[PDB]
Curated annotation (Swiss-Prot), chains A, I:
It is found in: Cytoplasm. It catalyses: Cleavage of peptide bonds with very broad specificity. It comes from Archaeoglobus fulgidus (strain ATCC 49558 / DSM 4304 / JCM 9628 / NBRC 100126 / VC-16). The formation of the proteasomal ATPase PAN-20S proteasome complex, via the docking of the C-termini of PAN into the intersubunit pockets in the alpha-rings, triggers opening of the gate for substrate entry. Interconversion between the open-gate and close-gate conformations leads to a dynamic regulation of the 20S proteasome proteolysis activity. Its EC number is 3.4.25.1. This is Proteasome subunit beta. The 20S proteasome core is composed of 14 alpha and 14 beta subunits that assemble into four stacked heptameric rings, resulting in a barrel-shaped structure. The two inner rings, each composed of seven catalytic beta subunits, are sandwiched by two outer rings, each composed of seven alpha subunits. The catalytic chamber with the active sites is on the inside of the barrel. Has probably a gated structure, the ends of the cylinder being occluded by the N-termini of the alpha-subunits. Is likely capped at one or both ends by the proteasome regulatory ATPase, PAN.
Swiss-Prot record, chain B:
It is found in: Cytoplasm. Disulfide bonds: none annotated. ATPase which is responsible for recognizing, binding, unfolding and translocation of substrate proteins into the archaeal 20S proteasome core particle. Is essential for opening the gate of the 20S proteasome via an interaction with its C-terminus, thereby allowing substrate entry and access to the site of proteolysis. Thus, the C-termini of the proteasomal ATPase function like a 'key in a lock' to induce gate opening and therefore regulate proteolysis. Belongs to the AAA ATPase family. Residues 46-48 are annotated as: Docks into pockets in the proteasome alpha-ring to cause gate opening. The gene is pan. It comes from Archaeoglobus fulgidus (strain ATCC 49558 / DSM 4304 / JCM 9628 / NBRC 100126 / VC-16). Consists of three main regions, an N-terminal coiled-coil domain that may assist in substrate recognition, an interdomain involved in PAN hexamerization, and a C-terminal ATPase domain of the AAA type. Homohexamer. The hexameric complex has a two-ring architecture resembling a top hat that caps the 20S proteasome core at one or both ends. Upon ATP-binding, the C-terminus of PAN interacts with the alpha-rings of the proteasome core by binding to the intersubunit pockets. This is Proteasome-activating nucleotidase. Transmembrane segments: none annotated.
From Swiss-Prot, chains C, D, E, F, G, H:
It comes from Archaeoglobus fulgidus (strain ATCC 49558 / DSM 4304 / JCM 9628 / NBRC 100126 / VC-16). This is Proteasome subunit alpha. SUPFAM superfamilies: N-terminal nucleophile aminohydrolases (Ntn hydrolases). The 20S proteasome core is composed of 14 alpha and 14 beta subunits that assemble into four stacked heptameric rings, resulting in a barrel-shaped structure. The two inner rings, each composed of seven catalytic beta subunits, are sandwiched by two outer rings, each composed of seven alpha subunits. The catalytic chamber with the active sites is on the inside of the barrel. Has probably a gated structure, the ends of the cylinder being occluded by the N-termini of the alpha-subunits. Is likely capped at one or both ends by the proteasome regulatory ATPase, PAN. Gene3D superfamilies: Glutamine Phosphoribosylpyrophosphate, subunit 1, domain 1 (3.60.20.10). Component of the proteasome core, a large protease complex with broad specificity involved in protein degradation. One of its GO terms (molecular function) is threonine-type endopeptidase activity. The formation of the proteasomal ATPase PAN-20S proteasome complex, via the docking of the C-termini of PAN into the intersubunit pockets in the alpha-rings, triggers opening of the gate for substrate entry. Interconversion between the open-gate and close-gate conformations leads to a dynamic regulation of the 20S proteasome proteolysis activity. PROSITE patterns: PROTEASOME_ALPHA_1 (PS00388), PROTEASOME_ALPHA_2 (PS51475). Belongs to the peptidase T1A family.
Length: 202, 48, 242, 242, 242, 242, 242, 242, 202
């Protein structure tokens, strides 16, 4: 499996593949890998479905409680660090998930990549996560632009996953992309996204 | 209060005057306090 | 003297155990908060008059977000309020953790009542001397009063604190179920007016609402509260002529 | 003095518990409830006629579904009811958890009392000054009253709350053990009518029942209630003219 | 009063907690600590007045560093304050650990108020007889006063201690809302000068502050107290002759 | 006064704890202990005076060693000292566990005043009723009086005990910050001899001292007190003729 | 006094804990235990007469073995004597467990004082109503008296119980350090003669001693007692010719 | 002295525990039990006398085996004896578990007493209301009396309960140390007769004994009580003729 | 994955190579593996990003707690022991990491090597640690004199790890220098470092 993230100056744009494939397996008809943490906050996971979903419930519940406490919107940092800590305290029940918890706040736009050993680290350019990550970097780093919008960012999140998929058998499809342009939380949803790669193949 | 006024005038006599002033008053007051305070405000050193 | 209000583990022969009705008297002394229920939402109003110009005219808060669809307002000690409001916010979220369902006003209410009663029942700890108003729209508007006893009482519209009796009389006459959001809002600003026997200026009151057609909490901005108040003051003045 | 009544772990020189005898009267200080057993089910009737037009007609509630086929009424302090019925409900589903058995009416009340025994013995906690009446059909109808002490009494007709004394007298002459469901339902209401001293309106009193054909908790909405009430109201009139 | 002040568990029929107020009479035994909040920073000024010339001036202080951009003062017991404020350090720390965001001054205050609050509810352990002034700047300055209950009140000009009533009177009159850091600093030296009722030496006082631009805690050296103190002494002498 | 001294939880109306007041009398009944701090070290001297020759040559033990360069001496209840000091040694060892640094006197003092503070909070456990003067040389000499209240106060020359008042008055004239190592320790013997109202001999005083220049605590033999005692008698004699 | 003595927690205006000093009165009633140190060991002599002659008074017994060079005699409750001695026994064997050293006289005393003291500060539990004298030669004679308070006073001769009064007043004249093993054993036996006001029988008395040149607790059989008892009986009789 | 008697954490100002004094009066509102020691063993007798014939005296027990060579008798509450002998049985056997050794009479007497002391430290538990007489043969006969206070005393003849005084005056004249088994038994029986003031009937007395020669406990039936009871009863007749 | 450190004569310099890869996701290559304990105290990690940052955050918090509570700046030995005692606490799950803690304090310059399990030993002026340890000792000690400064110490730090990199293949390219002279706590980051050794390698 594989998930991608990039930091634009207009938003944060990330992508997932909903399917989680062992190597031929179909986990589910559709499932969730993109969790809406806020209209400005997102969680895109590569790893297990069940751990990712488990952690997400906790986090969604604590984002809104943290908001009511400071009477101030959750920062990107504050959700990130919480997940590092949540993982290490509850590791008694095994965790095998990499998270990308990102979004938009006053400081700007940023993504934090979290591994299940812990850690939250600052990314302002390129990030990709999973077994398809190695291939994905090849694509993203050559075609990155700092001045990039969310409009050319979706095309890239597609391209990056699309290559991982065509060279990993353990990378499922059902490609959803989330865009957070700082005005809304758009999900293109599978049907349009499949048409972005229809014009990259043929 | 009538006794304290009387102490003060007597205090003046001890100080070789007929003039009653503020130091004559302060001792006169203390004499009467002696009876009915002290209550220690020396526990103010234990308060920040 | 009574000897039935030394601890909460004592009862009166009267049945009206006094030490939790003395937790009630704690509420009354505190300053006012009114809940007004309409068909287009619920409106909730509370004092912010407190202190002079030493004190903030932006004192935070009496009008608590509990959820992004539930508000709460208080009277009694804002100390006892603090810990209780904390538990409310986690509890509400706890329903969300284990269901992913918005807690309804009625279900939220029953849980804070249960929390209150832990402290009420044990004699090695005192009740919270605070009352709560819980206002939301789950999908039907609802309003409750939770007593410092952690007892539950439902109202059409209700108030607590020093101005309880004035408002009580005010809505006795005028309150109807056919009031619109505008009508009911201005009516509760008149009633708050009376409670403090004075006009309303937009910094003496914090006012929030949960709307039917959004079902989300939003707090009315200071200058946005200014036109409701402007029409209310007219009326508060007519009645303080008397 | 007298008592020996500021501790629950101290008995009076009579040998009594003043503290519990005092907590028995707090049930009475609160609102009436009328339970009636007939041979074609068991009806529990609860007073929800209280306060002015400031409150909603729904005032919670006072007749909780405990199980599918078991219900209870409450009289006394609300705060104490809230937690008692919480435990009651959880224990009703716990029997099904460990036996997959619909809990008997009998056993459920015995364990409502057993919880309350603990809060009568241990001085670290108050007695609950609240009484539930427990109506259901295990497979025959049974009506119990649970007590603050944890004493347990099977009735076949009863009152508790404000009407406790009044209605015992009503039923010496009137109540028989050969009444129909309908007759019984009307007669429990005449008595309720007797308690407040006034005509009943079904728009603020809540009736539930468990029949023997049904074996399910049902609840009677006010449209249905109307003919029962109309046969009660003639008799409430007859009574208050003598 | 009379047994309804001799435990913390109690209430009075006044609806006071007399025990908490007595805990607040503890705050008034100790010395004055005064804060002003201005738009360009926050000012904290503490009494460091020694009872003797054998007392060492270095610690008898009120001012505690808590966070990089948070300091605070205390009034109450010495004993209670250091334990309580070492708790506020920890709490500030916890927040930095788990969110990686330095604690806002407002959140801190809610957290440490709730900590005092478990000790006010509980019967087995006393509340602290302390009030704090929690002063910091997060993005823009903030100033709060904690009560001995745990109540939380937002302020813009505030005092605790013995000198408090006169400082309340003083900031009514004198303080203006257009004032800078420098101008409001001098004014707080005149206010400390008033309360101690002499023209200050800069070795019986201590100043800490947080500016928005610096976004730091500093502690004002004796070298650096003197221009504020000299300016002050001029206006302080005028109030001690008039 | 009454009822505010039957536990450590209760405050009296002035905000004073009368329980805590009785704890200072606890310090004052017991034997005098004087500390005099100079630039070159800090000397701690405590009364070893016995009312019989049937008590030991050195009665164990008036001046404890509690770390490499940190000592304390006691006045008040010497029973509590055994426990207090068992703890003080451990806390100073502990900091050597967890940072492997010599603990500073201040932070050691903070921690012991937390251990008092722990028994002050709880009303189950009565507080420490003994006062210790913890003295050591870190970055520079430091000297504290840690009180039963759980407060620390720093002094530059100090006293506690029976002699407490007499040696405050003495140092007010005689102590100065120009005193050598020798002129200081000798000045404390003069202070001690007034206090008992007798010439000093080595068997009725116990001296240790702390050097800067060795950076170590030493405990001075009765033999090597003998010269200083001799020097001291002249001044004591003059003082006892005044 | 009153009210400062019907709890452990309370301090009096004197600073004393009258509760603990009343458990020293529990010791004071029954019976002499005598310790006498000398420069050739330490001898511990104790009473062993108990009631009439049905009681076997040739056993039970104050001089309990605690280590191979540690023995203590008791005065006060027999009930408290067993547990405190048992703890003492535990602590001695902990030193052997963990250091493979018999524990020193000083440290055992130090410890067992701290144990009594822990129990002083806890409320709802009392200190022990027994007093011991801790006699041993580690490599040096020591003789201690450990107090029901949990304080430590080293003596070179003392007594507790009924005979405390007699033996003090005797030891003013007689006691010296020029005593040997023999002169001390007979002299403490005279001391005890005065205390019960009679001549001694080696049946009703028991002696254990810890010698420097053996480093053993040894318990003296009545045949061995008897020679020393002859020496003493003539002295005791001349002194009861007053 | 008044009020130093309603806690057991509380010594009185006269030194004595009056709480314990009142715990030794519960034994005396029980039925006598006499123990007498002979060279050939140890005999334990107890008053099984019962105030009526609707109870069956034989089964009501009085005197229980504890170990296979230790028996024990009770006086006081039946109730407190049940906890205490269950303690006893478990403890006697616990020695056999980890040493494989039948428990020594001293040692069991000691361990029961340490149990009883522990209920006399803490004010949270009522001290025991019985006394046991512990009589077995370990390797030699021993005959103890345990006290509710948790003290042990060796005796060679003793009683507990209401007859305690009379059996002391009796055995003061007639007790010898050179008694045989048959003589001791007779003497103890005679003595019990004085205490009840009347003849013995085999059917309301229980006698159990442990011989040195055999070291096995055996219990005397009514059948075999007969020879002894004729011989004893003649003496009782003569003695109480006077 | 190898770290170096040297005491200069006037500052402490440590360096850490960025490139951490676990599986087919590269964790670090553009994200840090050095954390700020106090103003002029650092801790460098060789080992996983997740372990390294989670444990360092506690030490960083408690470093602040130290500073404020006692008004005393903590030393290198103070931070060192504390870290050792905490690695005792949990060791049920992955918590085996090689830490170097050094920087400037008010008793000199120090480096202390903290063993994975607990324990702390001191190094006069040269440390390493890592799997490139053997190659690094040579390069640093030959060019180490008592009289080397901080400018030429930062140059050296890069040379030890990049000579070592060749013999290794648990490490790759991307490197960070940190310089702690008491006038700056600057984090050099890939760009700058690649450019200084561009003159000293070609």
């Amino acid at each position: 499996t594989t998930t991608v993230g990039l930091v634009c100056k207009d938003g944060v744009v990330m992508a997932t593949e909903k399917r989680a494939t062992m190597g031929n397996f179909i986990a589910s008809k559709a499932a969730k890998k993109i969790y809406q943490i806020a209209d400005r906050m997102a969680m895109t996971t590569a790893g297990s479905v069940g751990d990712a979903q488990f952690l997400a419930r906790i986090i969604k519940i604590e984002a809104n409680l943290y908001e009511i406490r400071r009477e101030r919107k959750p920062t990107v940092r504050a959700i990130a660090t919480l997940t590092s800590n949540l993982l290490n305290s509850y590791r008694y029940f095994p965790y095998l998930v990499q998270l990308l918890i990102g979004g938009i706040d006053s400081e700007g736009k940023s993504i934090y990549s979290i591994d299940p050993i812990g850690g939250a680290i600052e990314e302002k350019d390129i990030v990709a996560t999973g077994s398809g990550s190695l291939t994905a970097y090849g694509v993203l780093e050559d075609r990155f632009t700092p001045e990039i919008g969310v409009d050319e960012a979706v095309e890239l999140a597609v391209r990056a996953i699309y290559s991982a998929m065509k060279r990993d058998s353990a990378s499922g499809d059902g490609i959803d992309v989330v865009k957070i342009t700082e005005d809304e939380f758009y999900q293109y949803s599978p049907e349009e996204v499949e048409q972005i790669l229809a014009k990259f193949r043929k | 209060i009538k006794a304290i006024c009387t102490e003060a005038g007597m205090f003046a006599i001890r100080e070789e005057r007929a003039k009653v002033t503020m130091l004559d008053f302060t001792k006169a007051i203390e004499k009467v306090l002696k009876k009915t305070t002290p209550i220690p405000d020396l526990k103010g050193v234990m308060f920040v | 003297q009574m000897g039935y209000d030394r601890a909460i583990t004592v009862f009166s022969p009267d049945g009206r155990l006094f030490q939790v009705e003395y937790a009630r008297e704690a509420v009354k002394r505190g300053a006012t908060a009114i809940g007004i229920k309409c068909k287009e939402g619920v409106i909730l109003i509370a004092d912010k008059r407190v202190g002079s110009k030493l004190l903030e005219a932006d004192t935070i808060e009496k009008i608590y977000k509990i959820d992004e669809h539930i508000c709460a307002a208080t009277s009694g000690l804002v100390a006892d309020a603090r810990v209780l409001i904390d538990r409310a916010r986690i509890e509400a979220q706890i329903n969300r953790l284990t269901y992913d369902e918005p807690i309804t006003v009625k279900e939220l209410a029953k849980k804070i009542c249960d929390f209150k009663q832990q402290y009420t029942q044990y004699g090695g700890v005192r009740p919270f001397g605070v009352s709560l108003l819980i206002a939301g729209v789950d999908e039907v508007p609802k309003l409750y009063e939770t007593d410092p006893s952690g007892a539950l009482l439902e109202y059409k519209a209700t108030a607590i604190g020093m101005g309880r009796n004035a408002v009580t009389e005010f809505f006795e006459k005028e309150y109807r179920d056919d009031l619109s959001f505008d009508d009911a809002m201005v009516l509760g600003l008149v009633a708050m007016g009376l409670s403090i026997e004075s006009e309303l200026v937009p910094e003496n009151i914090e006012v929030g609402y949960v709307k039917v057609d959004d079902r989300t909490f939003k707090e009315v901005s200071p200058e946005e509260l200014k036109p409701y108040v402007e029409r209310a003051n007219e009326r508060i003045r007519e009645l303080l002529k008397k």
